[PDB]
Amino acid sequence: SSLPVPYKLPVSLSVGSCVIIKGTPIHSFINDPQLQVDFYTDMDEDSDIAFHFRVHFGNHVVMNRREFGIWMLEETTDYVPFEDGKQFELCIYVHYNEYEIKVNGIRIYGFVHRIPPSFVKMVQVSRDISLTSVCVCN
Amino acid sequence: SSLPVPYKLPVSLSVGSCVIIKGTPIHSFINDPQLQVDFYTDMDEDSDIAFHFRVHFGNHVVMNRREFGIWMLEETTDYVPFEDGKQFELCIYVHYNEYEIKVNGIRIYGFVHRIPPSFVKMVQVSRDISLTSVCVCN
């Protein structure tokens, strides 16, 4: 891995920001690897989460948020266009009303903001991936 | 301009970070446009500056730092491979001992750290450019 995992990146996000994560799963899909990305409100892992994204490669994606320490109503989609054994590009674009999630250039979901994205101060990338790069662009 | 100028971007930098700035000068070189990038230690414009970079397009680059509010000994180079009227890519790479400055893929200088780069909390891009994008990568 070019970068350590879990990877905790301090960030400042605004409307128009894009988080770009490039990496490769460390297991084949028959072994049920996962990728997780959390938009944390502080560096502390127990802080609230504006957007939690967990990919079960070859299966489905689960999303949620944690407010006042409480996980809210989970959201899901079966559209997970990641390829077995290959590098992926995951883009999370901050729109005024939602995070748009793109996988390898394919829009898969829009997760609506329940707190403003400018409250996000750390992005954590975790679980079963080798991380090649992480970029924050505007 | 895709982005407002001056553009003040909160950042967290570490060894291995790269700041990538893409834009175009707003004047032809016969009109002496400038581009400035400052690695500020706070959002406040009067805070100390770990690395100040000022391009006089077609002419030269001046670099400095501001410590305890005092500008230190200025550094310069005549190598400014920006092209008149064209978009440029400026990359500032954080190495353990210096910022390496690349213009359109060409290394032009290494500005040695006098304070650690992790003290940089804001990057300001200013002066005579239309700003297409700014990215911070690791």
Residue numbers in the entry:
A (entry chain A), B (entry chain A): 2 to 139
What did the published study say regarding this structure?
Galectin (Gal) is a lectin that binds to β-galactosides. Because the primary and tertiary structures of Gal-13 are highly conserved among all galectins, it had been named galectin-13. However, our crystallographic and biochemical experiments (solid phase experiment, hemagglutination assay, and biolayer interferometry) proved that wild-type Gal-13 could not bind lactose or a rhamnogalacturonan Ι domain (RG-I-4) from Ginseng Pectin. Primary structure alignment showed that a highly conserved histidine residue was modified to arginine (Arg53) in the ligand binding site of wild-type Gal-13, which may be why Gal-13 could not bind lactose.
We assumed that mutation of Arg53 to histidine would be sufficient to recover the ability of Gal-13 to bind lactose. However, this was not the case, and R53H did not co-crystallize with lactose. In the present study, we used PEG400 as the cryoprotectant for R53H crystal, and not glycerol. Mass spectroscopy identifies this compound as Tris. However, here, lactose could not co-crystallize with R53H, but Tris could. Tris has three hydroxyl groups and binds in a triangular shape. It seems that Arg55 plays a role in stabilizing Tris in R53H. However, the hydroxyl groups from Tris could not be merged with the oxygen atoms of lactose.
